[PDB]
Amino acid sequence: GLKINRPRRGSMGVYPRKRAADIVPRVRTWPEVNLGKPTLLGFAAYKAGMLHAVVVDDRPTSPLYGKEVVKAVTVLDAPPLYVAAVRLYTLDPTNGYKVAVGEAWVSEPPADLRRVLTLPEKFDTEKQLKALEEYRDVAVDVRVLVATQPRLSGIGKKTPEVLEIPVGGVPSIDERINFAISLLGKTVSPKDVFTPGQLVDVIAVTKGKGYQGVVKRFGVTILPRWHKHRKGHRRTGTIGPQAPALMFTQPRPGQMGFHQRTEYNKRILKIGDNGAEITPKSGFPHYGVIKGPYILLQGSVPGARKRLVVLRYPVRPPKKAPPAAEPQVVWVSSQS
RNA sequence: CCGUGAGGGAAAGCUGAAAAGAACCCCGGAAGGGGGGUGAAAAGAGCCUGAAACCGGGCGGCUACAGUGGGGCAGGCCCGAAAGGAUGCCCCCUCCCGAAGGAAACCCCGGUGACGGGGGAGUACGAGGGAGGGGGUCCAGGGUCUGCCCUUACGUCUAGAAA
RNA sequence: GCAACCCGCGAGGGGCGGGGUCUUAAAGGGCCCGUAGUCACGGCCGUGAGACCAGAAACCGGGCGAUCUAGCCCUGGGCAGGGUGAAGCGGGGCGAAAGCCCCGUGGAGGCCCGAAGGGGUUCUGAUGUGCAAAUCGUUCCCAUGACCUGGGGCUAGGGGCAAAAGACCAAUCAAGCCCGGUGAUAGCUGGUUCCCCCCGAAGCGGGUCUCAGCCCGGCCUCCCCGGAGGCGGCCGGCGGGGUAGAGUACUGAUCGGGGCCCCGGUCAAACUCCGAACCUGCCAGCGCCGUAGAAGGGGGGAGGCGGGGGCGGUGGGGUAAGCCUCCGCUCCGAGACGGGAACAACCGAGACCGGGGUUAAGGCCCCCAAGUGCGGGCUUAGUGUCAAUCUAAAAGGGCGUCCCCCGCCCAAGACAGCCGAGGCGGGGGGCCCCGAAGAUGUACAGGGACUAAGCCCGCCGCCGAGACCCCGGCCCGCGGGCCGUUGGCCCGCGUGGGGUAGGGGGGCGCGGCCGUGGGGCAGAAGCCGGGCCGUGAGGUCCGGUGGACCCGCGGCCGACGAAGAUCCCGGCGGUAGUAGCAGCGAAGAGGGGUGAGAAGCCCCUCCGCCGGAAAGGACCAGGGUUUCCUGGCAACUUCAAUAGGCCAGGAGUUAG
RNA sequence: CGCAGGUCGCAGUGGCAAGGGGGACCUGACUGUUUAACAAAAACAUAGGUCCCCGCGAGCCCGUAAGGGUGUGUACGGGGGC
RNA sequence: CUUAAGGUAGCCAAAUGCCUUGCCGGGUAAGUUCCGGCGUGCAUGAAUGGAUCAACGAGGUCCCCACUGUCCCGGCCCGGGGCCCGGCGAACCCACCUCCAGGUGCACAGUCCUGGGACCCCCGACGGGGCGAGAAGUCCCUAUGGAGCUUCACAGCAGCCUG
RNA sequence: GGGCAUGACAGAAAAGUUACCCUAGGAAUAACCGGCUCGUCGCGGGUGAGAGUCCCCAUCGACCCCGCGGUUUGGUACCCAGACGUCGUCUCUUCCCAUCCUGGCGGUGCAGCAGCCGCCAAGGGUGGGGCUGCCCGCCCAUUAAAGGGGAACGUGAGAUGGGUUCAGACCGUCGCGAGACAGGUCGGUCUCUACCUGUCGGGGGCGCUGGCCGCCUGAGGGGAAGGUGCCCUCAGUACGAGAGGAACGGGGCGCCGCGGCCUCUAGUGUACCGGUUGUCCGGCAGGGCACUGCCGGGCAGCCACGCCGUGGGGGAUAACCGCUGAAAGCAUCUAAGCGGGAAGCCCUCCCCGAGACGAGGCGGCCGUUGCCCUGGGGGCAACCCCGGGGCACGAGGGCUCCCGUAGAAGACGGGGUUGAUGGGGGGGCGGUGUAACCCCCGAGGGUUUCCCGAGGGGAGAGCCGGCCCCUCCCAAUCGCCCGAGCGUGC
Ligand SMILES: [Mg+2]
Ligand SMILES: [Mg+2]
Ligand SMILES: [Mg+2]
Ligand SMILES: [Mg+2]
Ligand SMILES: [Mg+2]
Ligand SMILES: [Mg+2]
Ligand SMILES: [Mg+2]
Ligand SMILES: [Mg+2]
Ligand SMILES: [Mg+2]
Ligand SMILES: [Mg+2]
Ligand SMILES: [Mg+2]
Ligand SMILES: [Mg+2]
Ligand SMILES: [Mg+2]
Ligand SMILES: [Mg+2]
Ligand SMILES: [Mg+2]
Ligand SMILES: [Mg+2]
Ligand SMILES: [Mg+2]
Ligand SMILES: [Mg+2]
Ligand SMILES: [Mg+2]
Ligand SMILES: [Mg+2]
Ligand SMILES: [Mg+2]
Ligand SMILES: [Mg+2]
Ligand SMILES: [Mg+2]
Ligand SMILES: [Mg+2]
Ligand SMILES: [Mg+2]
Ligand SMILES: [Mg+2]
Ligand SMILES: [Mg+2]
Ligand SMILES: [Mg+2]
Ligand SMILES: [Mg+2]
Ligand SMILES: [Mg+2]
Ligand SMILES: [Mg+2]
Ligand SMILES: [Mg+2]
Ligand SMILES: [Mg+2]
Ligand SMILES: [Mg+2]
Ligand SMILES: [Mg+2]
Ligand SMILES: [Mg+2]
Ligand SMILES: [Mg+2]
Ligand SMILES: [Mg+2]
Ligand SMILES: [Mg+2]
Ligand SMILES: [Mg+2]
Ligand SMILES: [Mg+2]
Ligand SMILES: [Mg+2]
Ligand SMILES: [Mg+2]
Ligand SMILES: [Mg+2]
Ligand SMILES: [Mg+2]
Ligand SMILES: [Mg+2]
Ligand SMILES: [Mg+2]
Ligand SMILES: [Mg+2]
Ligand SMILES: [Mg+2]
Ligand SMILES: [Mg+2]
Ligand SMILES: [Mg+2]
Ligand SMILES: [Mg+2]
Ligand SMILES: [Mg+2]
Ligand SMILES: [Mg+2]
Ligand SMILES: [Mg+2]
Ligand SMILES: [Mg+2]
Ligand SMILES: [Mg+2]
Ligand SMILES: [Mg+2]
Ligand SMILES: [Mg+2]
Ligand SMILES: [Mg+2]
Ligand SMILES: [Mg+2]
Ligand SMILES: [Mg+2]
Ligand SMILES: [Mg+2]
Ligand SMILES: [Mg+2]
Ligand SMILES: [Mg+2]
Ligand SMILES: [Mg+2]
Ligand SMILES: [Mg+2]
Ligand SMILES: [Mg+2]
Ligand SMILES: [Mg+2]
Ligand SMILES: [Mg+2]
Ligand SMILES: [Mg+2]
Ligand SMILES: [Mg+2]
Ligand SMILES: [Mg+2]
Ligand SMILES: [Mg+2]
Numbered sequence A: 001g002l003k004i005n006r007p008r009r010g011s012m013g014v015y016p017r018k019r020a021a022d023i024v025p026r027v028r029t030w031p032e033v034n035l036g037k038p039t040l041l042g043f044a045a046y047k048a049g050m051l052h053a054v055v056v057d058d059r060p061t062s063p064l065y066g067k068e069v070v071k072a073v074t075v076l077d078a079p080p081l082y083v084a085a086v087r088l089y090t091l092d093p094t095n096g097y098k099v100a101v102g103e104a105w106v107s108e109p110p111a112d113l114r115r116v117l118t119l120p121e122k123f124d125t126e127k128q129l130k131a132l133e134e135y136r137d138v139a140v141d142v143r144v145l146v147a148t149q150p151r152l153s154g155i156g157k158k159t160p161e162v163l164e165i166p167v168g169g170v171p172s173i174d175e176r177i178n179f180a181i182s183l184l185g186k187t188v189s190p191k192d193v194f195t196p197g198q199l200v201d202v203i204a205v206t207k208g209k210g211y212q213g214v215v216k217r218f219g220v221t222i223l224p225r226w227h228k229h230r231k232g233h234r235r236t237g238t239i240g241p242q243a244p245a246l247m248f249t250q251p252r253p254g255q256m257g258f259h260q261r262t263e264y265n266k267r268i269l270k271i272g273d274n275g276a277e278i279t280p281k282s283g284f285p286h287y288g289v290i291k292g293p294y295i296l297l298q299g300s301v302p303g304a305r306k307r308l309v310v311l312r313y314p315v316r317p318p319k320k321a322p323p324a325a326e327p328q329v330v331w332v333s334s335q336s
Numbered sequence B: 001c002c003g004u005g006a007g008g009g010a011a012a013g014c015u016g017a018a019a020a021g022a023a024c025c026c027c028g029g030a031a032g033g034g035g036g037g038u039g040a041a042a043a044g045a046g047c048c049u050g051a052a053a054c055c056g057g058g059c060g061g062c063u064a065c066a067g068u069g070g071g072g073c074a075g076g077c078c079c080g081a082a083a084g085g086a087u088g089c090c091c092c093c094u095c096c097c098g099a100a101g102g103a104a105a106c107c108c109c110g111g112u113g114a115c116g117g118g119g120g121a122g123u124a125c126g127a128g129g130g131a132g133g134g135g136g137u138c139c140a141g142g143g144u145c146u147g148c149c150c151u152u153a154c155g156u157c158u159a160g161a162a163a
Numbered sequence C: 001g002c003a004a005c006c007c008g009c010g011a012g013g014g015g016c017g018g019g020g021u022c023u024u025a026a027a028g029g030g031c032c033c034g035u036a037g038u039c040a041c042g043g044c045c046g047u048g049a050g051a052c053c054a055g056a057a058a059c060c061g062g063g064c065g066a067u068c069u070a071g072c073c074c075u076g077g078g079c080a081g082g083g084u085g086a087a088g089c090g091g092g093g094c095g096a097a098a099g100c101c102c103c104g105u106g107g108a109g110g111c112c113c114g115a116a117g118g119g120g121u122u123c124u125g126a127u128g129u130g131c132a133a134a135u136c137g138u139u140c141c142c143a144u145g146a147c148c149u150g151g152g153g154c155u156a157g158g159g160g161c162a163a164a165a166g167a168c169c170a171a172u173c174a175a176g177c178c179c180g181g182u183g184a185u186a187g188c189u190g191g192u193u194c195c196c197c198c199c200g201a202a203g204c205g206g207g208u209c210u211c212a213g214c215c216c217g218g219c220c221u222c223c224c225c226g227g228a229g230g231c232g233g234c235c236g237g238c239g240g241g242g243u244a245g246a247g248u249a250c251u252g253a254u255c256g257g258g259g260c261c262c263c264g265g266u267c268a269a270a271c272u273c274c275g276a277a278c279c280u281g282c283c284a285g286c287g288c289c290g291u292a293g294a295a296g297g298g299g300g301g302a303g304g305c306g307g308g309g310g311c312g313g314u315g316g317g318g319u320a321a322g323c324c325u326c327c328g329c330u331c332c333g334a335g336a337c338g339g340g341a342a343c344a345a346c347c348g349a350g351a352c353c354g355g356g357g358u359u360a361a362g363g364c365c366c367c368c369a370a371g372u373g374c375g376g377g378c379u380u381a382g383u384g385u386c387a388a389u390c391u392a393a394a395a396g397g398g399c400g401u402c403c404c405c406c407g408c409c410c411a412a413g414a415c416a417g418c419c420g421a422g423g424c425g426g427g428g429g430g431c432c433c434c435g436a437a438g439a440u441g442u443a444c445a446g447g448g449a450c451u452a453a454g455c456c457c458g459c460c461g462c463c464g465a466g467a468c469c470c471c472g473g474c475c476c477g478c479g480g481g482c483c484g485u486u487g488g489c490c491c492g493c494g495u496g497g498g499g500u501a502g503g504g505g506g507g508c509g510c511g512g513c514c515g516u517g518g519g520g521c522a523g524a525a526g527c528c529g530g531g532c533c534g535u536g537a538g539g540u541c542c543g544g545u546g547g548a549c550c551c552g553c554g555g556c557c558g559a560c561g562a563a564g565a566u567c568c569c570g571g572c573g574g575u576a577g578u579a580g581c582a583g584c585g586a587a588g589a590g591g592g593g594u595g596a597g598a599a600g601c602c603c604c605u606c607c608g609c610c611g612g613a614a615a616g617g618a619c620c621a622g623g624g625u626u627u628c629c630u631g632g633c634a635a636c637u638u639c640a641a642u643a644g645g646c647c648a649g650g651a652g653u654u655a656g
Numbered sequence D: 001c002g003c004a005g006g007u008c009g010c011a012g013u014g015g016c017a018a019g020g021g022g023g024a025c026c027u028g029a030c031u032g033u034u035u036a037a038c039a040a041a042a043a044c045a046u047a048g049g050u051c052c053c054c055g056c057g058a059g060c061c062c063g064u065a066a067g068g069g070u071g072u073g074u075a076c077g078g079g080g081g082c
Numbered sequence E: 001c002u003u004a005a006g007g008u009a010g011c012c013a014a015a016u017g018c019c020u021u022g023c024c025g026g027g028u029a030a031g032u033u034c035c036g037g038c039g040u041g042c043a044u045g046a047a048u049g050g051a052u053c054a055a056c057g058a059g060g061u062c063c064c065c066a067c068u069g070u071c072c073c074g075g076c077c078c079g080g081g082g083c084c085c086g087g088c089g090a091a092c093c094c095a096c097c098u099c100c101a102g103g104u105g106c107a108c109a110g111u112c113c114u115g116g117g118a119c120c121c122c123c124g125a126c127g128g129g130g131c132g133a134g135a136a137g138u139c140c141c142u143a144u145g146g147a148g149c150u151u152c153a154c155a156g157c158a159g160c161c162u163g
Numbered sequence F: 001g002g003g004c005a006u007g008a009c010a011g012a013a014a015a016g017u018u019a020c021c022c023u024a025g026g027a028a029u030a031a032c033c034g035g036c037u038c039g040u041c042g043c044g045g046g047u048g049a050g051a052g053u054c055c056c057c058a059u060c061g062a063c064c065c066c067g068c069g070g071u072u073u074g075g076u077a078c079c080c081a082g083a084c085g086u087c088g089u090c091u092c093u094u095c096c097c098a099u100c101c102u103g104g105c106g107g108u109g110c111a112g113c114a115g116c117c118g119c120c121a122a123g124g125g126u127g128g129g130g131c132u133g134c135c136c137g138c139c140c141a142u143u144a145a146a147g148g149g150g151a152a153c154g155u156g157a158g159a160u161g162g163g164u165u166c167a168g169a170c171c172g173u174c175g176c177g178a179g180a181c182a183g184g185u186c187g188g189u190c191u192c193u194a195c196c197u198g199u200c201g202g203g204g205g206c207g208c209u210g211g212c213c214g215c216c217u218g219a220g221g222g223g224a225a226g227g228u229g230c231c232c233u234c235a236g237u238a239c240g241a242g243a244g245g246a247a248c249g250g251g252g253c254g255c256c257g258c259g260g261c262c263u264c265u266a267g268u269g270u271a272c273c274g275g276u277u278g279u280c281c282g283g284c285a286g287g288g289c290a291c292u293g294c295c296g297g298g299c300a301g302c303c304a305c306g307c308c309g310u311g312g313g314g315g316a317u318a319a320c321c322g323c324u325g326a327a328a329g330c331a332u333c334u335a336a337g338c339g340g341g342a343a344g345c346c347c348u349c350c351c352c353g354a355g356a357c358g359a360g361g362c363g364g365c366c367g368u369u370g371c372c373c374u375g376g377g378g379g380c381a382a383c384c385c386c387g388g389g390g391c392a393c394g395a396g397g398g399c400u401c402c403c404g405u406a407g408a409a410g411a412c413g414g415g416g417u418u419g420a421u422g423g424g425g426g427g428g429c430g431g432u433g434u435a436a437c438c439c440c441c442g443a444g445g446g447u448u449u450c451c452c453g454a455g456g457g458g459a460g461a462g463c464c465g466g467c468c469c470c471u472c473c474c475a476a477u478c479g480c481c482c483g484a485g486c487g488u489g490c
C-alpha cells in the first residue's frame, strides 16, 4: 500500500461532486417532534450576512459559564411564508412508497405565483377539500406547499420559491390535517415555527466556486520541492495503479462549490421582527437591508449571500438539551 | 537542380477533321457564373478515354434499451427493363410410387416403478420421384435491416498464433 | 485336359561355365566379355557465372577536400572603469655609532573586482514534430595575456594535426569523402504472384572446426525392370532370453539369539540357485495382401535432418518443475466435426456436396435437445453439485451422525443413585465437522440456483456428431472396350473420397508470333452496374459511357498472373478545421484620404521602443539587380492587404 | 575636500546599479588547455628536477629517389624519456 | 628458503582496508558520512615520486553563523500560454478499432468462456490501460562476420647492424 | 609392401583485448517482470523428552513428522531481443489478514499496578526526526500504537536521478602488454501536440404511449463522515505486609479526518491612497519610464494560520457466555426451543438519484382544429381517400436584451417598463492620510525687515470604492424561432 500511512485526501461521501439539480435545497428527512400542538417542522429564509455578537454562556457545566463570549453569527432575512396548498400522503400497499393522494389549493393565489406555475384562474377550493376528505382514513402524512415572498426581502426579486413543509408537533394525523387546512391562504412567520434558543438543522446549496484543481477540490498536497518537478506541481503524481484502471475514488479536477449540504445543531440566538435593529448602517454587503423579521443563528451557514436556506427541527440532537431560557445577546457588531 | 569538390541528377507526351479557340446579352472588383453559340461529339485549351482511394449531394435500409464483422435459415422495407424463368413460383386438395427409418389409441402378459413385450403394424407416416384440379401474381436475383443458429483479422518463423 | 491344372520349346531375365587382362611361385582374387548408339527438341536437377529478389559492417584502387575544425607561419584590429602597490627615489623620528620605525613618491605583475569580448558551470530551468539536426533564460569562468579577433599561407588519409579527450581534418573519424573493384560474400533475416485432381512425410542413426549448415542411410513421390510370393495379427511344433517377482545360496551389507558354526530377521542399479508375463528365430497352418503384380532391383525429384501431447517402463536424474535425458503405442504438427464452460494433441470420432434416419462420448430443473425419471440409504456442512487439462489439501482430532463386528455384566439380585431392563468396554466402515489464512467483484470452478438439481448401491427411457445406414449428384484409382488418336467417349470393380512440406497429372489468364475463321463508325478497346454459364482459374451476354481497333479456334514463344517485402512511385484520407502562428523586457489608438473592399496602405495628432544600439552612421567578404519609377494582386509573406526584398513594364553605377 | 546649523521618512549606495561570511579534510602548486553535440575534472600542459643519444661528415626524423627537416643552428646546443 | 633483496624515511580503514557501520575520542536528542588518533597495512611507500596546503580553485566533502515559501502548508496577485471568436492551417500515429469482473489460451485477451452493466451524441482535463509512439535492443548469445589496439600468437615486409 | 601424424583421434599450421566499439540474426539463449516449481524463506499444526518449587501442555517445546503462502533466495527456460524504460524515493488510489492500537471475549505461574498467551474482528489509525543512494537496519523524542503484505518487485507517455549500469579520470590489486575487477572514487542528454478507452466534471437530443408546468416519491448507487486521546470526580478508594495503586458511572476539553463559512485575526489585494529616487515633459502642479521603479497602508473578493458542524440508537449476528432439556432414569449451553453477546454486517444519518424501459405519484395548464396551394384514385352528382407543401389556433420553451446567488464553452439564477436589471446623480458606509487657497513659524542668508528658504502648525481635507439605500435621468428595445393536434394493432 502506501509507504507511510495517512487518511485519504477528501471524502467519498459527497460523490459525485456535481452541481446541484436545484438552487433550492430538497430536504430528504424531516424529524418527528412532539411539541404538544400542530406546527410546521421547518422554515425557509434568505442568508443575508455574518456578524459577531457578545453572548453570555448559559451552559452551567461549560468552562465559560456566566462569561461574555464573542460568537460569529449568521443573519437570515425571514419574511413570512404564504401557504398556498395542502397535500396528503399515503403509503402504497404494493411497495410501501409514500405517494401523494391529493392536494387542495387556495382559490385565488397571488400574482407572483403565476411567474412559476400554470394555475387556473380560480381554484375550486371547497371541491378540492371534499376530494381530499375521502383520503383522511388512509392518510399517513400531511404537508403544506408554501411560497416565499422575495418582495419582502432585501433581494427584492419577484419570482418566489415553492416548497413542501410537513406539519408535525402532535402524533395525530387528523389534528395535523385540520391545522394544515386552517393554514390555507395565510402566512406563517418564523416565530410561529421556532422559538429562540433552540437547535435547528440548516440545509442549503453552498457557494459555487466553478471548475477547480485537484489541490483545492480534494486537498491533495502540492509536490514537495515544487521547482524540481517538470510538468507542474499542482497535481497528483500518479492517477492510479495498473489494475484496476482509473477508479471513481481517484481525486480529479471538476466542479467545486454548488452542492447541497446539511449542517446539524445550530442554535437560534434571536428571532427579531424588524430588521432595522440588526442591519448595519452601511447595510449588509452584497445583500442590502432587512426590513421584516429576521433570524439570528449561531455559527456559519452553507450557501452564498442570497441563498435560500431551509431550517428544520434537528434530526441528530445532542443528549443534553440547551437551556430553556432564551440566550442573552448583549450586543451585535452591527449595532453602535 | 544538389554538393566546397571529386562527383551526383529529376519530374514532365495526347483539343478538334477544321479554331470552327466560344460572338452577343445579364451579373461580378476579379478569377469567374447564368443565358446564348461552334462543333458529329466540349473534346474548352487546367483540352482523348477518365478507374479506385477520397470528399459532397440525392436515393434505399437502419438510427438514440442495447455490444459491432462473416455464414445459414425466416422475415420487414426497397429495386427487380434488358441480359434469367414467367411452360415460373407459391397455397390448397387429390392421386400414384417410395429408400433407410417408423409411430399412436386401444386390447393382452410382466414389473413398486420409470417401462419392456404379443396384436394394432413394417401399418399411419417417411428423402424423393410422377400426374392432375382450383386460387394468386410475379419468381430468381440484388441493397439494407431484424430474429434464431454458427463463428478466436490477415501474412510469417514456429512444437505451438486471435495473441 | 470340363476346367483345375499338367507337359514341351522357351526371346528377354537369373545362374553356372568358358574367354581377355592385372596380381601372385600358384591357387585364389579384381575388372571386362555372348550389342546400340548417336543427333535433336521439350522438361527436371547439379556446378560456375550476379544466378529467385533485397540486405551488411568491412577491404583495396585512383582521385577531391584545411570556406569548418587542429596546429603553426606572414600581415592588420581590440580590451570602459576601479583596486593593489614590486624594484627604485625623498623627508621625519631615534640613537655614540652599527643601525630600526613612520610617511610620501614610484608604477611591476601569465596580480585582483568588473563592462565589451572570449568561454561554457548550475538550475540537471525552457525547448525537446524546437527559434535552432545543440538554441534560449538564469547563474557563472577569464578578461595585460600561454589573451581575443580579420585577411593571406602551409600540413592530406594509413596520412595530417593534436597543452592528449583516440579529440579534429566541411552536420561524416578506433582511420574522411567521391567514383570504381561491385549485383563483394552472407550456413542469417524479409519477400517470392492463377485454378482443380492423385499420393503424401520428418525432426531418427552415422560423419563433419560439427551444434541456426551439409553429406550418407531411415521416412515421401514418380517412372521402369522383375516375376510369385509377402507379413503391424493368431494357433501349434522346435529354440533363445535372465527382466518383475523371489532369494539371501556366490560377492557385499545388516539386526538379534545360541553354541568359527547353527537359528530367526532386514537389504542390493553396478549380487544370483530359481524365474514368469513378455519379446524374439525357423517350420507348418489360419488370417489377410498379391498376377489389375509379392519379393527383389534400377532411375528422376525431394522435403526433412528444431518436434510436441497423453498414457506406460517406481523408466535414469532432480525437492520439484508446463524440468533434463532414453524406450513403446497413439494423436497434434499436417485432421474437419460432437463433448469437456473456453482449450493442438483428454473422451467420441475420422469430414467430396445436398437431404433423410440412427447412434458414440456425454447429457436430460433453466440457460440448453432430452427426465423436476424410478427404488433404497446417507449428508445439515449450501458440504457438494456426474474424469483429466482446471483452481486443491495432509498428519491429527470428533459415538456429529448412520452402520458392522468382538469381549464382558445382566439368569431380571445388571449401568444412575429400593428401583426393573438392558448396560459397559474395544475395533472398524460411510458421509460430514475442526485442522482449512491473500490480496479489483458475490456460498467461484460455467451461471441461476438446488436440501436435492448433493453423495452411495442399482435401475428405466430419451436427447445427442460430418461417425454408422439410405437416397441423389460429383470426382478418383485400377481393368475392359470403342473412335485416324500429342486426343475423346463408354462400361465394370474398389471395408475409393482429410491433408502441410514435397513428388506426379490436367486446366484458366496475360503479351506476341505461325496459320485459320471472323467482328467493327448501323460503334473496337477501355470503364460503371447487372443477368447467365463453369467446383474453379475464368467465360459470355445486357444497359450506360466511349470513339478505332478487336476477337474465336489449332500451333509456338515469353520482359506472363500479387495482399503483404519497416516493399518502390503517385494520389488521397482519419487525425482535424486540431497543434502552432506566446515566451528571447517596443504597442498601439483617433480622425481623414484612397479604394469594390481598410484595425493593418498614405497624411496629421496621441502613445510607446532604441539611442557606445537584436535598433542610429560607415563598410569588408558574400549575394547579384534585391536599388529607382510606374502598374498589379493568379501565386509568395505563418493572419490581411489597395502593401512589399513578390509579379509585369521601364530605368539606373560617369574618376589622372 | 571640509565644518556649523535646521529638517522629513518605515526606508537616504531610497529607483537603477550592487560581495553572504567563517572553520576543517582530500586533491591538483599556481595562470593556462580539453572530449564542436550528455564528462571542465583530481585529466592534459606548466615552470622546476633528472636521465639518455649526440663534436656536426653527429644524434633523431622524412623521402622511391633527387634530396629534405632539426639548421641563417653547435653542448649555456638539437633530439628522446620520466 | 628466497624469482635479486625483503618495504627504509615517512603516511594510512586514505579517491588505496575485504572483514568493515574496524576500535578509541569529537561533533548531533539521535552521525553507515566527516574530523583527530590507533595500525603484523586483503592489497600503502619514495622522481613508478614519499611527506607536505602557504597562495590559487565553476575541483570533491563535513561543520558553524546569517538567511530564507526548501519545508510545516498552503494562499493571494501580475504577464504570457489556457478557454471562446475571426483568419491561416500541418504533423505524429493508423489491419480493424476496444465498458467492467473472474477465467482460459504461445502461460499479462477488444475480439474466446461465464457473468456484471450501459439511452445516444458533444466539450474540457488528465495520463491508469491499449505489454501507447519513437529506434530491425547498444544489455546476453550465435556467426567457422568485421574493425581498431596489444604481445611471449601464426606468418610476412620495411628499417638498422653484419659478412 | 613397412614406417615417419594429425589424441579436436573420419585428420586447418594459429594468442589476447575492446566500456571506443560496428554488422547479420536469435526469445533455438541469459539479465528485469510474467509462467511453472518451493529446496530456501515466512507462517500453521501433530508429538511431548525436558523446564516450569509440585505440575508435560500458564508459558515454552529437544528428537522427529504433516502442512500452507508465494511475502526472500534459488531451480527451470514457456512467452517477450524490428525493444514491456532497469533500484530507491516522492505523489495518489485501492485490496489481503497471518491484528501493532482502537471494539468484544477467554486463560494465566491474573492481589492491585503491569505483563505474558489464545479466539472473533480489517470500520478507523499506524505519525515526527538522526545515520546510510538506499531497501533493510540501528537510534532519538513522542504516542493508543507508532503491523505486515498485494496491485507488471502498483504508479518514470507523472516527477526525481542519490545508486546501479556507456563513452573521461585517478587509486589498489591482476596482466609482459593492450587491458580487467559485482573493489573504492570524481563527472556524466530522462524524447512524444493524447488516436481509442477509462476517470472526473460540463452540455445537446430522443424516449417515458398526445404536449407541458410545478411539487413529490425512492429502486438502486456512494459514504469513515467520523476516528481517537487527555484531565477532574470516583479515590489515595478497592486490592495490598508495605510499596504501590485501579475500574464502572458522571463532568470538561483536545488531536487527526470530513463538510461548510469569512464575523474576528493573518495573508494577498498591479481596485485605491500616500511617501520617495533617477531622468524627460521649461519651473510649480500634474504626468511618462525604470516591466506596480521602489517603499508604506489598504475596501471588496479569495483564503487559513481563523470560525462553525461533525450522534446516539435498533436488528441479526462472530468468538463465546448462560436457561430449559432429552437422547443416556443422573448430568449436559444443544440435539428441538429460549436469553445475552463486537469499532464488524443491515437500517437509522448524509450526498446522487425515474434512461428505475415495470421510464413512477399528485395538482393544474394546453391540444384533441380550421383554412390555402398542388398530385393521384373512386365512382362524377355533390362528394370522399390518400401524397406533398404553406398558414392560423395553441399551453409551454428558447434566442435577442440588462445582469450575477452562477460561470472554461454550454449551462444555471434574477430582471425585463403593472420595472429599480446595469449605468448616471444624491445620500450611507469605508480606504488612504490632511490636497488647493489662505494665515502663522522657519536654521540662516541677501535685493538690510515684506526677498529666498528644507520644513512644522491651524481651517479645509483631497482622492477613491469591481459595496448599501433612494431617484426612471439613459439603456433593459426592436425583433427571430420551437411547439402537442393523426392513424394502427394487441
Ligand atoms: Mg527536470
Ligand atoms: Mg479528360
Ligand atoms: Mg426483368
Ligand atoms: Mg427471358
Ligand atoms: Mg517466432
Ligand atoms: Mg518459441
Ligand atoms: Mg512446422
Ligand atoms: Mg497467424
Ligand atoms: Mg551456383
Ligand atoms: Mg580481408
Ligand atoms: Mg587507398
Ligand atoms: Mg581556414
Ligand atoms: Mg589577471
Ligand atoms: Mg547535467
Ligand atoms: Mg533541462
Ligand atoms: Mg514540449
Ligand atoms: Mg574578472
Ligand atoms: Mg579511451
Ligand atoms: Mg583511412
Ligand atoms: Mg563504395
Ligand atoms: Mg491419403
Ligand atoms: Mg530461424
Ligand atoms: Mg510362436
Ligand atoms: Mg527385484
Ligand atoms: Mg524382500
Ligand atoms: Mg525386452
Ligand atoms: Mg535435433
Ligand atoms: Mg512422445
Ligand atoms: Mg467444447
Ligand atoms: Mg429443453
Ligand atoms: Mg501430501
Ligand atoms: Mg463450497
Ligand atoms: Mg485427399
Ligand atoms: Mg491461341
Ligand atoms: Mg504472400
Ligand atoms: Mg507512400
Ligand atoms: Mg489530412
Ligand atoms: Mg480557431
Ligand atoms: Mg493553441
Ligand atoms: Mg527599456
Ligand atoms: Mg527609452
Ligand atoms: Mg548598424
Ligand atoms: Mg524597392
Ligand atoms: Mg513600387
Ligand atoms: Mg523580381
Ligand atoms: Mg536589479
Ligand atoms: Mg589546476
Ligand atoms: Mg583556472
Ligand atoms: Mg561534450
Ligand atoms: Mg558540460
Ligand atoms: Mg598531470
Ligand atoms: Mg619539485
Ligand atoms: Mg622510472
Ligand atoms: Mg613500515
Ligand atoms: Mg573519506
Ligand atoms: Mg591501513
Ligand atoms: Mg607496496
Ligand atoms: Mg603513483
Ligand atoms: Mg607500488
Ligand atoms: Mg609526490
Ligand atoms: Mg597526505
Ligand atoms: Mg493457463
Ligand atoms: Mg488489443
Ligand atoms: Mg535485432
Ligand atoms: Mg542493431
Ligand atoms: Mg557488450
Ligand atoms: Mg558453425
Ligand atoms: Mg581499417
Ligand atoms: Mg572427428
Ligand atoms: Mg524459450
Ligand atoms: Mg526469470
Ligand atoms: Mg515490465
Ligand atoms: Mg522452512
Ligand atoms: Mg503438546
Ligand SMILES: [Mg+2]
Binding pocket: none
Ligand atoms: Mg521467485
Ligand SMILES: [Mg+2]
Binding pocket: F079, F080
Ligand atoms: Mg508472451
Ligand SMILES: [Mg+2]
Binding pocket: none
Ligand atoms: Mg513487443
Ligand SMILES: [Mg+2]
Binding pocket: E131, F084
Ligand atoms: Mg507500456
Ligand SMILES: [Mg+2]
Binding pocket: none
Ligand atoms: Mg515502448
Ligand SMILES: [Mg+2]
Binding pocket: none
Ligand atoms: Mg483472523
Ligand SMILES: [Mg+2]
Binding pocket: F153
Ligand atoms: Mg514496479
Ligand SMILES: [Mg+2]
Binding pocket: F156, F190
Ligand atoms: Mg520517463
Ligand SMILES: [Mg+2]
Binding pocket: none
Ligand atoms: Mg507509466
Ligand SMILES: [Mg+2]
Binding pocket: none
Ligand atoms: Mg548519479
